[PDB]
Amino acid sequence: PDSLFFTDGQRRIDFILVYEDESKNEKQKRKRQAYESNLICHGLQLEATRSVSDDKLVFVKVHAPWEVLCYYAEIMHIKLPAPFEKSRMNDFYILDRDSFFNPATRSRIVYFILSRVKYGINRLVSSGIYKAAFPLHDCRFNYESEDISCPSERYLLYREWAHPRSIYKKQPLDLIRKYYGEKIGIYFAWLGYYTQMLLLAAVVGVACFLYGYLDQDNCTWSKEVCDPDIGGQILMCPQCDRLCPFWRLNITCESSKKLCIFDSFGTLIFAVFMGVWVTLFLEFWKRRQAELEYEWDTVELQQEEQARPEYASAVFFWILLIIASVIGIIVYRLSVFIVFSTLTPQMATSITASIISFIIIMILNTIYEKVAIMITNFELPRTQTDYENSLTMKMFLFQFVNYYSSCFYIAFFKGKFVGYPGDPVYLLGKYRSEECDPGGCLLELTTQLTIIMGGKAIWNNIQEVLLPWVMNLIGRYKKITPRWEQDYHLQPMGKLGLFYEYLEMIIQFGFVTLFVASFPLAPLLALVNNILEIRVDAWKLTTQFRRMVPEKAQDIGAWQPIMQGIAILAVVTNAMIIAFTSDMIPRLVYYWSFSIPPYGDHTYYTMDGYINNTLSVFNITDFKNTDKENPYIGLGNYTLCRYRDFRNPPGHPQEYKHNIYYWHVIAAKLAFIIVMEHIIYSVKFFISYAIPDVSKITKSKIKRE
């Protein structure tokens, strides 16, 4: 039969206490017997049934007496499965005296009973008293349950919302929380809304990218870079010590033509628009959170204090973060170094460098996870919620640095403070600073960013779930045991599965919002990843894992502060990216100021001559001020070389000092930073303040009565 009720008995089970017979250490048998006897004596039904699949395994099942269960549920602030009270027995319409209650709530009550009972379920399992304790699923996802009385909720939810055949179908949050709990419901609601407006971000980003794409023909500076008569004649200086010749600037036609895509006005407008998209996300999410909190049974009081089975050094943690960021930076730098020490060539080298760095990030991720777990266990938190909050902050900071160290270095600290070839900078000693090509390092920042985004999303989700699904797909294209035994054969989520899910989503949100200027198509990848992830998470939760006790919560958790921090950091990082990593400001300044007779020689504003009239000049006879061996020996009969910097030419009264163009450009950069940051912050404040003028609709729904 394998029914959900007691064998030949009209009573429903709520937890399975499986123990192994001693027959194949009397202390363990005595302890288990005492614990089981006390549990039964407390007023909970008990029965032991031999496993059909294996005779050795003797499973123990329980029940829920109606009166005691209802009373102890009333012990805590629980509403109707609208407070529940026998004096109001007739007030609430009841389909049946013994099955009206939600099985999820019944399992929650039995779990609370087990938790409060004292002589440690996890402690007993560690000592062997109870091998496991879990509730039961309604029906098999493979084939429907034999008992017709079962509504078959699990398989229905599977077919409707987990299987890819419903990839485009809407998310049924109703059955989701009614079956699993508030945690899963709110998680999936947040993820769905996240995707919903990632669609808007993606469409705007695609529009901007296409606008950039259509203007390859009119990209004047790239054309000048390519014309051999102009670009080829320019002979740039070597960018390294012993392993680089004097090179023409035109060898970078492919790089410049690609970079003219991601470095146009489209990118600037897209960054400005994302500046307000982020605040729209936050504000509408607060709206939806209020809506969900009111709609659902989310008015349950919380305990003042809680116990925990287990029960300054903060500066030491900061040292760990510092060494983590430095290790990431060094990992990327050595990766690029080793791969270089050996269209297609340079781009492939950069791609392989990014891949190697991301691989090393993945291997180090486990190390940060373990060290964070150990250091947070060292404090021995008294309670639980504080433990999850500490884990969230510590794990998030480790992931943040481990994932953004390379990107931040490539954006801000690469080629930003290298001097002219006469007096180069060695910040650490015998460690020359790498310098970007005339276009800038924006393109290879974008490469690193996209590689990390993709690689993480794909590899993680694929390797962690899609295995059985991919073997099933390959096959497609190219004895009776009770429910408790089958559910035992499954494995549990542990205590941090939802935590890891929020970690993945928050890291993705960081990728898509922090460096959005460099890569405007990041929202598209985030959208595709989320469309995959919703169904992947639903499938794995409904299929591969034991039943989870529901929990009560109103907010996503300790992440909302992290979301706001990410947004307020993203605005400034985008401003800095556009100001410094990109070269939009220097070329605008040239267009508007240095193409006019006082400085230029054209009769109108134009981009003509930007490259030739912006590159500085260097004098080999000034090869070095230390008068040591120089890289300019040999390498042809060349006399003068040009480098990417704004400095006075040789023979000027101020020999190789920053000229007026440098200061004009830097003033323009700072003006852009301040004006854009002030505009964006002002608009964000206005949007936040306009909740009465914006989101009145759902508050009106609440207030209508």
Ligand X SMILES: *[C@@H]1O[C@H](CO)[C@@H](O)[C@H](O)[C@H]1NC(C)=O
Binding site for Ca(2+): residue ranges? Answer: 464, 501, 504
Among 294, 413, 599, 638, which residue interacts with its own copies (rule: CB under 8 A)? 599
State yes or no: residue 307 binds its own copies (CB under 8 A): no
Q: How far is the CB of 197 from Ca ion (least distance, A)?
A: 18
Residue 627, Ramachandran bin (φ over 0: left; ψ between -120 and 50: alpha; else beta): left
Q: How far is the CB of 642 from ligand X (least distance, A)?
A: 7
User: Given the structure tokens 């960013």, which residue do they identify?
Assistant: 449
Which residue from 566, 591, 572 is spatially nearest to 673, judged by alpha carbons?
572
Among 276, 673, 683, 694, which residue interacts with its own copies (rule: CB under 8 A)? 673
Which residues make beta-bridge pairs with 182?
none
Which residues of the chain form contacts with Ca ion (CB under 5 A)?
Answer: 460-461, 464, 501, 537
Among 63, 177, 547, 664, which residue interacts with its own copies (rule: CB under 8 A)? 664
**Partner whose footprint covers residue 621, from ligand X, Ca ion, its own copies, none (CB < 5 to 8 Å by kind):** ligand X
Among 75, 338, 667, 691, which residue interacts with its own copies (rule: CB under 8 A)? 667
Which residues make beta-bridge pairs with 48?
60
Binding positions are 464, 501, 504
Q: What are the C-alpha distances in Å from 121 to residues 33, 35, 131, 137, 263? A: 14, 10, 9, 20, 59
State yes or no: residue 653 binds its own copies (CB under 8 A): yes
* Number of residues near its own copies (by CB under 8 A): 17
Which residue from 44, 10, 4 is spatially nearest to 136, judged by alpha carbons?
4
Would you say 251 or 569 has its CB closer to ligand X? Answer: 251
State yes or no: residue 25 binds its own copies (CB under 8 A): no
- Residues 152-171, one symbol each (x = binds its own copies by CB under 8 A, - = not), give --------------------
Would you state the structure tokens that stand for residue 369, as one six-digit string?
């996870």
Dihedral sign of CA atoms 68, 72, 75, 78 in order: negative
Q: What does the DSSP 8-state code read for residue 607?
A: S
Q: Could you give phi then psi for residue 674, rounded to 5 degrees? A: -70, -45
Would you state the structure tokens that stand for residue 182, as one six-digit string?
């508030």
Would you say 202 or 676 has its CB closer to its own copies? Answer: 676
Contact, 69 vs 106, CB < 8 A?
A: yes
Which residues of the chain form contacts with ligand X (CB under 6 A)?
Answer: 228-229, 232, 248, 250-251, 609, 612-613, 617, 619, 621, 639-640, 649-650
State yes or no: residue 659 binds its own copies (CB under 8 A): yes
Would you say 2 or 501 has its CB closer to Ca ion? Answer: 501
Q: How far is the CB of 262 from ligand X (least distance, A)?
A: 21
Helices (H), 90-171: 103-116, 121-127, 153-157
Would you say 124 or 191 has its CB closer to Ca ion? Answer: 191
Angle between helices 497-514 and 182-213 (to 10 degrees): 20
**Partner whose footprint covers residue 471, from Ca ion, ligand X, its own copies, none (CB < 5 to 8 Å by kind):** none
Would you say 68 or 596 has its CB closer to its own copies? Answer: 596
**Partner whose footprint covers residue 653, from ligand X, Ca ion, its own copies, none (CB < 5 to 8 Å by kind):** its own copies
Alpha carbon distance 351, 441 (integer Å)? 14
**Partner whose footprint covers residue 385, from ligand X, Ca ion, its own copies, none (CB < 5 to 8 Å by kind):** none
Report DSSP letters for 176-220, one per residue: HHHHT-HHHHHHHHHHHHHHHHHHHHHHHHHHHHHHHHTTSTT-H
**Partner whose footprint covers residue 460, from Ca ion, its own copies, ligand X, none (CB < 5 to 8 Å by kind):** Ca ion
Alpha carbon distance 582, 665 (integer Å)? 12
**Partner whose footprint covers residue 432, from its own copies, Ca ion, ligand X, none (CB < 5 to 8 Å by kind):** none
User: Given the structure tokens 């294996």, which residue do they identify?
Assistant: 54
Would you say 99 or 461 has its CB closer to Ca ion? Answer: 461
For the chain, the residues before each gap (C–N > 2.5 Å) are: 24, 81, 119, 311, 342, 478
> Which residue number is nearest to ligand X in terms of Cβ?
232
Which residues contact its own copies by CB under 8 A? 572, 598-599, 653-654, 657, 659-660, 663-664, 666-667, 670-671, 673-674, 678
